[PDB]
């Protein structure tokens, strides 16, 4: 919803600008909004397309690149810390949780679907928390298995017109 | 004289507006009167830039035959102008000139030093002076290089997903090399945004172009649909047997350290590829290729398994490891995950015994899913039957032939 909107904003700010080269603050907000839709080339191509004095400007893009690189390396933990060890700017608070929301649901996702037994340790490796935390968590979703083996198991439990128009064509 | 006789012509031009005189001068002026520098327009044009900034364009022309113009920003301005105060249908004017006028702009200066200043420009410019979205023109061409220069691929997505059909004459002005340039350039586009098939397309459409003449332009889209037919299926796609002679004559020769990669890829030994590849770096780095044939390599370790995939049904991981030579099971289990997660594969890990199991039934043709999918693909397909109706009656009308058989 209001990721697309900002897109949009975005996009419009990048496609007509009098000035030429916009602020450091635009510019890091667009890296973080296409770091957010996991679209990884857009992100690296507007990355490299960045003049070297804007990104010595502020250390913010230094920041959304590190994330960029550790989140393209698929190193969920390393995303997971990289997503909090440094501070930022405030227009790009509200999209910085919004994306690991995001990487969470994908790490669910993924760890669900891609696994059907997985050590406990690799799954909150795989959640950036606290193993107890998931066990409790994963227990009351009901998707786990046991204990003491240390051995979550992650389950996943007008025709009528289009009709006439295809006969219409077919008759010639 | 010149002066008043631009102010007054002008004014019946526009105004009086009748086409005969003002096609008359349009022409007279042409490439031969346009010489000899400006008509004095240094002192009498200043006056006249600002009478109508309309019949001026083609005098734009001239003002951009003299190289390195010392104000850039006159330029920004009249088409701002032309952009602002654009009405819309009278653009008609400018058909055949316009081309030329910003090919000549961009192939200055937009291209050495602010190649993004251009990129909404001339998109702009396209749907304002091309009749049809059916039709390739050769401000395509400039704006597909002005967006791989500028490393941005976004913006010139939508002019490259419609399939271009028909190609405006430009008065005899589009050269065969503009078309070839635009199936290449933008073939670079899809090789940016991991689009391979239809980079293969484009790479395939500028090979099978009828020319008797080596270029250079040839030769890299050559190079490049080998390396994404590579790349993408487990070998090189035979080209359509229409295409040109010269490109099994001369092309190919040239062209020899692909082709041997080619075997090497084909031959299923990734241990040899890298040698090869350490064999001839140079060659690949003279022609920028250091990432591509890097992915060709990556994507062997996964054709490998995916053969494995249709031979086991369940298999260790140091098995996998051994067969795919990925040297270690965890490096064996990195690469299943990930490709799962890209839906190459159908798979499961059981970390129990370090298996790794293949469940290859994702689809069973029972949901409404396919039947959209049937769906799109009669609407698509009673598209271009209509289009190719339309066009068969379109080229009826001729009498070229059919006197009297």
């Given at each position: 919803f209001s990721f697309k909107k900002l897109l949009d904003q975005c996009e419009n700010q990048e496609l007509e600008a009098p000035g030429g080269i916009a602020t450091p603050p635009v510019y890091g907000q667009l890296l973080a909004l296409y770091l957010l839709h996991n679209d990884m080339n857009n992100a690296r191509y507007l990355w490299k397309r960045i003049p070297p004095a804007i990104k010595s400007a502020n250390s913010e893009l230094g920041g959304i690149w590190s994330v960029g690189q550790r989140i393209w390396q698929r190193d969920f933990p390393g995303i997971y810390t990289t997503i909090n060890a440094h501070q930022w700017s405030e227009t790009v608070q509200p999209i910085m949780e919004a994306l690991r929301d995001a990487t969470r649901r994908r790490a669910f996702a993924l760890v669900s679907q891609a696994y059907t037994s997985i050590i406990a340790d690799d799954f909150a490796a795989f959640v950036g928390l606290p193993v107890e935390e998931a066990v409790k968590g994963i227990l009351e979703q009901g998707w786990q298995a046991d204990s003491t083996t240390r051995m979550v198991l992650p389950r996943k439990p007008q025709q009528l017109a289009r009709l006439t128009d295809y006969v219409a064509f077919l008759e010639n | 004289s010149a002066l008043e006789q631009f102010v007054n012509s002008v004014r019946q031009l526009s105004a009086?507006?009748?086409?005969t005189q003002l096609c008359e001068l349009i022409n007279k002026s042409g490439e031969l009167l346009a010489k000899n520098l400006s008509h004095l327009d240094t002192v009498l044009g200043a006056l006249d830039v600002?009478?109508?900034?309309?019949?001026v364009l083609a005098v734009l022309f001239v003002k951009f035959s003299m190289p390195s113009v010392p104000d850039f920003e006159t330029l920004f301005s009249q088409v701002q102008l032309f952009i602002s105060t654009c009405?819309?249908?009278?653009?008609?004017?400018?058909?055949?000139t316009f081309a030329g006028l910003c090919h000549q702009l961009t192939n200055a200066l937009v291209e050495r030093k602010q190649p993004l200043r251009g990129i909404g420009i001339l998109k702009q410019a396209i749907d304002k002076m091309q009749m049809n979205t059916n039709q390739l023109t050769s401000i395509h061409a400039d704006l597909c290089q002005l967006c791989l220069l500028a490393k941005c691929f976004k913006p010139a997505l939508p002019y490259l997903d419609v399939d271009m059909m028909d190609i405006c004459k430009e008065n005899g002005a589009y050269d065969a090399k503009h078309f070839l340039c635009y199936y290449y350039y933008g073939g670079m586009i899809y090789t940016g945004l991991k689009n391979f098939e239809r980079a293969l397309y484009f790479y395939e459409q500028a090979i099978t172009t009828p020319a008797m003449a080596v270029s250079h332009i040839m030769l890299e889209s050559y190079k490049k649909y080998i390396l994404v037919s590579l790349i993408l299926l487990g070998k090189v796609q035979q080209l359509p047997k229409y295409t040109s002679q010269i490109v099994g004559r001369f092309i190919k020769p040239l062209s020899n350290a692909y082709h041997e990669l080619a075997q090497v890829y084909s031959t299923n030994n990734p241990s040899e590829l890298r040698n090869l590849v350490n064999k001839h770096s140079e060659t690949f780095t003279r022609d920028n290729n250091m990432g591509l044939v890097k992915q060709c390599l990556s994507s062997l370790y996964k054709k490998n398994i995916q053969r494995l995939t249709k031979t086991f049904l369940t298999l260790s991981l140091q098995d996998m490891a051994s067969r795919v030579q990925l040297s270690g099971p965890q490096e064996a289990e990195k690469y299943v995950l990930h490709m799962i997660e890209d839906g190459e594969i159908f798979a499961s890990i059981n970390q129990k015994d370090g298996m790794v199991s293949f469940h290859d039934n994702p689809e069973k043709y029972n949901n409404p899913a396919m039947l959209h999918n049937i769906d799109q693909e009669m609407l698509k397909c009673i598209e271009l039957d209509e289009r190719l109706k339309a066009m068969d009656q379109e080229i009826t009308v001729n009498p070229q032939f059919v006197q009297k058989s």
């Open positions: - | 009086q507006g009748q086409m600002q009478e109508h900034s309309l019949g009405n819309g249908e009278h653009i008609r004017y400018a058909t055949d």
